[PDB]
Amino acid sequence: MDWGRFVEEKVREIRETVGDSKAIIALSGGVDSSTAAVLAHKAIGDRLHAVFVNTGFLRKGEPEFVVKTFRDEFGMNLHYVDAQDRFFSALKGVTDPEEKRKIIGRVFIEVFEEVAKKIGAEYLIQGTIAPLNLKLIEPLRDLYKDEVRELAKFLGLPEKIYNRMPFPGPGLAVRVIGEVTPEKIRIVREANAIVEEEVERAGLRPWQAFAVLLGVKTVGVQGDIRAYKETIAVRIVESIDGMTANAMNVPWEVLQRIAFRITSEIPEVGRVLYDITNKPPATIEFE
Amino acid sequence: FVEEKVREIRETVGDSKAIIALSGGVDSSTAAVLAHKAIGDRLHAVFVNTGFLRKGEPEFVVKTFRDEFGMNLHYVDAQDRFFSALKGVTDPEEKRKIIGRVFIEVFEEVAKKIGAEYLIQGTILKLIEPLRDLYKDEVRELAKFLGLPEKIYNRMPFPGPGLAVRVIGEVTPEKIRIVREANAIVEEEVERAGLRPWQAFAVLLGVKTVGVQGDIRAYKETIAVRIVESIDGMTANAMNVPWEVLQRIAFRITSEIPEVGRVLYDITNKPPATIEFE
Known part of the structure; x- marks a missing residue:
């Protein structure tokens, strides 16, 4: 395998696709979205808007770690969105497991869409792997899970993310x-x-x-x-x-x-x- | 010790009938055997099936005391009464209270037919407590000596x-x-x-x-x-x-x-x- 070549070619592809426009990505803290975000950031810098939604259901220290990693260390144009009130309020009185997941999914899209509209990007980067009126870009589309982890390490992401x-x-x-x-x-x-x-x-x-x-x-x-x-x-x-x-x-x-x-x-x-x-x-x- | 206690019970009961609640526990079981060796056919053991007993437990108790030991055993199927009484109850305290109240109603109902004058209890009608001076460990040993199954004295x-x-x-x-x-x-x-x-x-x-x-x-x-x-x-x-x-x-x-x-x-x-x- 040749990760240096993969990164060079993929970053080039993203640049040629996005041009001078803005791109947006949902930063979940997972290895896939994190890896795709780093590639997109290397490609278009500040024109990549990384949106991180604090749902109120994240683990202890998780929100702080994501901000430290992507805003402070990687220097990404991060949008930290505190939407905890919206998620908790929407779940009032709901006990059914399936219904809870449905509601959470709906609220997440509402939140992401609200922020995305203000950003005005033309491209949506996703960490889709092999295993909003926006054009889709999936840099990791041809990679399998194990490969994405190797790539994440090569890109300098923390072990706390690539081995999470x-x-x-x-x-x-x-x-x-x-x-x-x-x-x-x-x-x-x-x-x-x-x-x-x-x-x-x-x-x-x-x-x-x-x-x-x-x-x-x-x-x-x-x-x-x-x-x-x-x-x-x-x-x-x-x-x-x-x-x-x-x-x-x-x-x-x-x-x-x-x-x-x-x-x-x-x-x-x-x-x-x-x-x-x-x-x-x-x-x-x-x- | 057995000869002594059996003698005391025999002197206290005389020719009257006695009743005892069999729970399957070592205490009531040991007291039942002692009382039985004392007044034999005039002892009336009562087993209430609450509907909350373990698998094969009711059968074991009946087989042990009625067949094996040859005691007069009154089997009471009160499952329906207990389930009805607990319908809709979620509080643990209320469940315990209700089960206790129903057990008494069921037991007193059976006790009236027997016409006993003495109540035997395995505390560790006139009351008779043949094990009121014995501790958990002592009762277990006594149970063994009396011939009670290991499934009981060691349960x-x-x-x-x-x-x-x-x-x-x-x-x-x-x-x-x-x-x-x-x-x-x-x-x-x-x-x-x-x-x-x-x-x-x-x-x-x-x-x-x-x-x-x-x-x-x-x-x-x-x-x-x-x-x-x-x-x-x-x-x-x-x-x-x-x-x-x-x-x-x-x-x-x-x-x-x-x-x-x-x-x-x-x-x-x-x-x-x-x-x-x-």
């Missing part, structure tokens, strides 16, 4: 069973951070590792009196590419640390359960 | 409300059936693997999810497996169960109980969590 575990577009909203509220998202966000921290501390490299707020209540104690507490499910799986996946045989000490930290550092949680179901028969997420 | 504790508190939310016949089957799988695999925990059981969580086979839009149930080690039950730790055993439990539950599509294992100690979920 996949994370759903609706984010933490699908990690909360039932109605999505700021409090539930706060709890699962902290629990998720603990899960990832313990997996990292033990040098484990699973396909996915996350926490889910089940909605099931258990009787705990806060001060010196009984109170209802939440239940968190921990999901850690091993997989080649998600086709099938096995619940991971996590060292007991790691599971103990996760359970201890979640219930001690997040007083609102009183019980932690570990998912031991493979795929098949189960899905990886809890939807 | 894990099981709550009065039974499987009703092993179902989060409203209790219904179908939910109890599902958790009864899951519970049997958990106990079977834990025993087969040589595990000897304080308690090992299954809980129907109420949370539902879709799977990746067959009708992928059909929401299925979730079972939580609870296995803990404890000395006294005051403090306990989630057990470090061998992975292959947990995998077998998950496989059997989803393969044998089509209604369940997800299995979770509780990894929380006590404190901060309770052993039972409700």
